Motif scaffolding. Structure first.
Motif, PDB file in Angstrom:
ATOM      1  N   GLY F 171     -27.433  -3.865  -8.981  1.00  0.00           N
ATOM      2  CA  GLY F 171     -27.271  -2.835  -9.992  1.00  0.00           C
ATOM      3  C   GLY F 171     -25.794  -2.542 -10.154  1.00  0.00           C
ATOM      4  N   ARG F 172     -24.986  -3.592 -10.042  1.00  0.00           N
ATOM      5  CA  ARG F 172     -23.541  -3.460 -10.159  1.00  0.00           C
ATOM      6  C   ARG F 172     -22.936  -4.469 -11.130  1.00  0.00           C
ATOM      7  NH1 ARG F 172     -19.124  -5.439  -8.583  1.00  0.00           N
ATOM      8  NH2 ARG F 172     -19.649  -6.897  -6.880  1.00  0.00           N
ATOM      9  N   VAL F 173     -21.954  -4.017 -11.904  1.00  0.00           N
ATOM     10  CA  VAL F 173     -21.256  -4.887 -12.841  1.00  0.00           C
ATOM     11  C   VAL F 173     -19.754  -4.535 -12.753  1.00  0.00           C
ATOM     12  CG1 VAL F 173     -21.424  -5.963 -15.118  1.00  0.00           C
ATOM     13  CG2 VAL F 173     -23.283  -4.447 -14.333  1.00  0.00           C
ATOM     14  N   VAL F 174     -18.953  -5.540 -12.394  1.00  0.00           N
ATOM     15  CA  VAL F 174     -17.502  -5.436 -12.214  1.00  0.00           C
ATOM     16  C   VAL F 174     -16.776  -4.656 -13.296  1.00  0.00           C
ATOM     17  CG1 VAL F 174     -16.783  -7.441 -13.538  1.00  0.00           C
ATOM     18  CG2 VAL F 174     -15.488  -6.780 -11.474  1.00  0.00           C
ATOM     19  N   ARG F 175     -15.542  -4.272 -12.983  1.00  0.00           N
ATOM     20  CA  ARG F 175     -14.676  -3.514 -13.888  1.00  0.00           C
ATOM     21  C   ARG F 175     -14.521  -4.185 -15.250  1.00  0.00           C
ATOM     22  NH1 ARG F 175     -11.119  -0.135 -11.279  1.00  0.00           N
ATOM     23  NH2 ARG F 175     -10.929  -1.698  -9.603  1.00  0.00           N
ATOM     24  N   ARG F 176     -13.910  -5.366 -15.253  1.00  0.00           N
ATOM     25  CA  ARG F 176     -13.666  -6.134 -16.467  1.00  0.00           C
ATOM     26  C   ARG F 176     -14.822  -6.070 -17.466  1.00  0.00           C
ATOM     27  NH1 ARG F 176     -14.384 -12.030 -18.936  1.00  0.00           N
ATOM     28  NH2 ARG F 176     -12.694 -13.143 -17.848  1.00  0.00           N
ATOM     29  N   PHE F 177     -16.030  -5.760 -16.996  1.00  0.00           N
ATOM     30  CA  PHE F 177     -17.159  -5.687 -17.913  1.00  0.00           C
ATOM     31  C   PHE F 177     -17.917  -4.362 -17.980  1.00  0.00           C
ATOM     32  CE2 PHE F 177     -17.542 -10.333 -18.811  1.00  0.00           C
ATOM     33  CZ  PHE F 177     -16.806 -10.860 -17.769  1.00  0.00           C
ATOM     34  N   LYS F 178     -17.702  -3.457 -17.023  1.00  0.00           N
ATOM     35  CA  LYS F 178     -18.417  -2.178 -17.054  1.00  0.00           C
ATOM     36  C   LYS F 178     -18.274  -1.608 -18.459  1.00  0.00           C
ATOM     37  CE  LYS F 178     -16.540  -1.300 -12.334  1.00  0.00           C
ATOM     38  NZ  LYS F 178     -17.676  -1.977 -11.651  1.00  0.00           N
ATOM     39  N   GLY F 179     -19.366  -1.590 -19.227  1.00  0.00           N
ATOM     40  CA  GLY F 179     -19.331  -1.062 -20.584  1.00  0.00           C
ATOM     41  C   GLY F 179     -18.726  -2.052 -21.567  1.00  0.00           C
ATOM     42  N   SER F 180     -18.848  -3.322 -21.207  1.00  0.00           N
ATOM     43  CA  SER F 180     -18.336  -4.434 -21.991  1.00  0.00           C
ATOM     44  C   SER F 180     -19.199  -4.771 -23.209  1.00  0.00           C
ATOM     45  CB  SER F 180     -18.218  -5.665 -21.080  1.00  0.00           C
ATOM     46  OG  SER F 180     -17.903  -6.843 -21.792  1.00  0.00           O
ATOM     47  N   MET F 181     -20.400  -4.207 -23.299  1.00  0.00           N
ATOM     48  CA  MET F 181     -21.251  -4.532 -24.435  1.00  0.00           C
ATOM     49  C   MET F 181     -21.049  -3.658 -25.668  1.00  0.00           C
ATOM     50  SD  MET F 181     -25.353  -5.078 -24.493  1.00  0.00           S
ATOM     51  CE  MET F 181     -25.862  -3.346 -24.786  1.00  0.00           C
TER      52      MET F 181
END
Lengths: 250, 250, 250, 250, 250, 250
Positions: F171-181
């Protein structure tokens, strides 16, 4: 710290129950190496020791360092911790013309010339090697191609002045000794070591199994001088032998 | 390198002709710290060689290892190099009750409970100390203030059986030693150790002066042991006396 | 006489190959104080060089400084002499909630948040702990009771922002390290430090042994206050462990 | 007790707001004594804090250690107690032919070739000194009668790996740092040091005034031998400048 | 049937929590054919998977597909299902001229030269591997005496248009890969592969343990490429390893 | 006996200069079936080639395989084989609340969330498609009367985090993509596929044309329980299209 000298607790054997015991810390790591999981266990005076795994089993490699007295300690020390089978190892010089450098001797019993063994049993009692521990070796040597040998070794309390020789500062041997290499050479004795009698005797007299496997690295009664490499490698033939045998003894 | 173990050139002593010799090699540096400008001559295996000036005199320290055979190797070679006098220092237990932890015991003669000394002299000949060395040691001791006792000691070739010990694995003492300590404990004999037997005999019978001081780590007939610091008492009281002694005999 | 920043020469090391490294120079005197042959060598810059002997071998405890730009100096200054192994010991704060103050923490590889390391290799290359020195530490640390964990560490070139700290003058952290600690926690990193990135990265890329261990002198996520000695003692473990691991590599 | 690393208690600076932060403590001393009532406060790690005074006002002098990370703490820890105006002073060599080994340079801004600045403000951000601090300086040097230089400085994080030098255990000069020095010149760079791009940066990006002046002990741009008469001279002059400079700044 | 990719379902695992993930779909057979009662479970894109039983427990094995992007799906959806420990096994070529075509290497961490591994942790985090897994693989390779090797592996996202292959359509790579073998070589890299990075990187930073092991089919370094009987042992060795290993890690 | 991973020669493709590559091999059959004389040619890893004809001219299909590194392989070899035009049909997920499940997207160029393309051209260079291959698509999509949607895509090296999926194991998504969508969504991108990047960039930087079209199998941001019957036909048209699309490009 439960036994002295060694400086090891019963928890340092991870449940082990057998120790290969050479007489020199330079073989300990070499020995332990031929197995897996050699986590150096300690080094405390002259009793430097490790700890390894064989067929997913616990087996220790501890040394002795010249002198049956010296030896009597480590084994008893060990034994009180958990061990109960002391496979020994080592190289040597044989006193038989038919015996070569590259062959390996397996000591069945020993001439009790030491003095230390006299503290566990009278002299009428023998410095006898355990049966199983002897066959296990012969096998391990019966399988790599090492010209096996079997017999008795003289276990004397001395290097130069003791082992029948005449090369030193003065130039003699204790009366009752003067000319002992010859006589034994006539009773079928193979080599000349210095810890066996204590070992065999202190295990045999105390319900403890032990075996011995050396490695002829020179034969004094012959012209041809040995060789560096032969000695280097041969030394390892003896390493494998016991290492490989101990597995059955587990 | 002219020896076979100590690995030292006869020119390494730079004069040295005496030598304090402890069994444990660890202390070799501890001992040689007291003299003036010390240096580590070398230190192969259990044969640590340190040297140290003392009253402008090139003195030497060296280990003995455990056992009489190991000892025989040191002394013989050390004497070969250039030494004519030895002085042993150690730890030990005292059997007599009136003796105390952190006391110094000198030895004029030892009971031969080994089999190493036999290679240099028959059991009739006695394990006797040397006057010269008994002189200083006794004086140097009364000089630094130490409850000093002087007499006879038993040099057992084994730590557990020869010194009658049941607090072991089997708990058995071969007929021979069954009751030896309790018997000793009336002949006046003060303590137990392992290298004096070979040191005194061989020296006493080779034109080499020698003596032997030591301290009580424990009185076993006793039960309320010393203490770690009591353990450092010898590491100074006995340690100073042997150097205090070394001086006078320079 | 040999290098500059140290002031040591290929004779102060007594021919060595390993060396410890506490960034703080006022800890050197305590590392060696735990080893035979403890002698002081110098006191230049922050490189308070000291030497010792572990199991008869030469060990060169030495110090680095705050950061990897100084450590840069230290490491090569030492190796150039003749060192091919280094084991850092130090101070560290734990980001993981379950790691307690004291708990010794070993590392496998540190996250590159430094700059110096970038001078010895690309950011793609990994600042990895040498398998050789990593095992040793874990054994020792484990064969002593030390409450250990083994994992990932964060090597910051700063102590306040590059490790999220607001109790400061301003009280702000530049975009980059903003919320990072949080992510590291999720990412499962263990602690914060400032020297392992260079060291590790550095040796790997040059063919040098290198391992690392430290001690929990602080945790944030938690409550409890810093105790008494467990900010000097909290080291005691690491201090010893980095030493019990020292032996094994010699 | 008030600041972790340095010890300093807010009651130890007494309303001061300036602080000359040199490399080592030896320089921290020759500075303190020129001002008034130079009193010592404490000395931990590479941080030695003295207390002076200038014309009835308090002033602080503290060593910072090698590297940008080291300095990282000196500042914030001081700036946390009350200081707001920092001044750096040290020594370096030159890269521009038009500079003699006796000059003094001033840094308006420094090429950020570090790693601890990125922990304060993106590389887009300038490492420029304050205007007042950098005015007081350009004046103080003209005063004493020096040959000032006001320009830009190379603030590398290491030595050879980023300055076109080589000989050592050859530590890879990052592909990025190929053809560096020669390009630093062509872009009008005066010297090369190791902590300025980190000091100036943490300041400006936070609300503090920092300045930088240093003498040139060497100028490798030529092979013309360097006289130590200059070395000790250049030193003192430089320090005078800053201490005189600071006078205005207070 | 449970996971949008693999196919398997919670049920079709039988509590298993460790999986060996070889690239090819065949190897999987080779492996699984080694544990108890092998049983195919699914075959969908490039993700074929069987179930086994080792030393009493249930296990999994599963093809990954070329490159880390493909691996990324399997790993995740496996772990999602229950798999907590992984273990990769593959082939490759050496960069070092000392690596031989019969040797095997374990990777501590890899020079992240891929791209997919960047969707887990920043370019700083290392491609380090779980300490135990890594140890588990060095023992196995040992428990059967193999010309073993341990260290860092290099892994990019391309075959010929990257991993130093001046052989395809263009005959070179961008300004990044242009004489790098020689590069990483000088830094001590064992091999080149593609899925390693991604794997290690993704795992360490999530809370799973992963090990990387491989075998040298081609000695690409040298002017070499082996036959069809050795391109089989390479696998028997590697298969017995990661399997022998997995046993322990179970 | 020409190129490994694919396994095809030249006489093998009757001149065929254009080719269709639909990631999944299991879908190769039902495409070749739409054109003429559908003849199978191989099956290796996923690279399942299939020969077919159109208007008397040769056209081939060759599923690439998940991830860019895979495709990289396939394309690089087809190209060596003669091909010089590639059409890539495949499925995808849209991030816009106006594009339904079954729509048909046509890519002009996409975001470079891969890592392989960096080997083919700088990041600055664009990941765009040929124009002939783009009008060819669109028009024919108009042709069968399919609901088309021209635009841009986002090519991720990893399927779960690359495209901000939180429902993972950590349930984790790195910085570079957090809210990348939302950054993309707002920006004007329509889909999230995994091979569009390497393809286009790789082709558009050598001379080969290329295209990209996909059917909406799942609209992320969307919900409205997808009507069962619609999902297969969904992929259907987007197949018909490319086949027909390929018509004009011959």
């Amino acid at each position: 710290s439960d036994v002295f000298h060694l400086g090891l607790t019963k928890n340092d054997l991870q449940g082990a129950q057998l120790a290969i015991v050479p007489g020199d810390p330079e073989r300990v790591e070499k020995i332990a190496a031929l197995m897996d999981k050699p986590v150096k266990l300690a080094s405390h005076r002259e009793f430097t020791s490790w700890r390894a795994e064989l067929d997913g089993k616990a087996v220790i490699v501890c040394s002795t360092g010249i002198g049956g007295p010296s030896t009597s300690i480590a084994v008893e020390e060990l034994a009180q911790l958990g061990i109960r089978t002391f496979l020994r190892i080592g190289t040597t010089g044989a006193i038989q013309p038919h015996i070569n450098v590259g062959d390996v001797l397996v000591t069945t019993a020993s001439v009790r010339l030491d003095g230390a063994s006299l503290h566990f049993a009278p002299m009428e009692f023998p410095a006898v090697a355990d049966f199983a521990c002897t066959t296990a070796l012969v096998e391990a040597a019966k399988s790599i191609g090492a010209t096996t040998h079997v017999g008795v070794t003289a276990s004397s309390d001395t290097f130069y002045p003791g082992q029948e020789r005449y090369d030193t500062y003065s130039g003699r041997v204790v009366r009752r000794f003067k000319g002992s290499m010859e006589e034994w050479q006539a009773m079928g004795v193979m080599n000349y070591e210095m810890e066996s009698a204590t070992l065999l005797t202190m295990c045999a007299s105390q319900g403890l199994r032990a075996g011995m496997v050396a490695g002829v690295i020179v034969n004094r009664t012959q012209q041809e001088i040995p060789n560096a490499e032969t000695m280097k490698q041969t030394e390892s033939h003896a390493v494998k032998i016991v290492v490989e045998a101990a597995r059955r003894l587990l």
